[PDB]
């Protein structure tokens, strides 16, 4: 739950796209929520 926030969609593309979804907020996030 720490390496990957809970309620977040954690998926990284080999294209070099690290995206995180807020499955709670219904929002797309490009920048890692752990660094803010």
């Amino acid at each position: 739950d720490v390496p990957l926030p809970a309620g977040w969609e954690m998926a990284k593309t080999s294209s070099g796209q690290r995206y995180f979804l807020n499955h709670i907020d219904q929002t797309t996030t490009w920048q890692d929520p752990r660094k803010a």
């Binding site: 969609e9 998926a11 995206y19 979804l21 797309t28 490009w30």
Partner: peptide
Amino acid sequence: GESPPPPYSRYPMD
């Protein structure tokens, strides 16, 4: 400069 990301609907990529 990112290209549009996964749709929120259910799952990003299959």
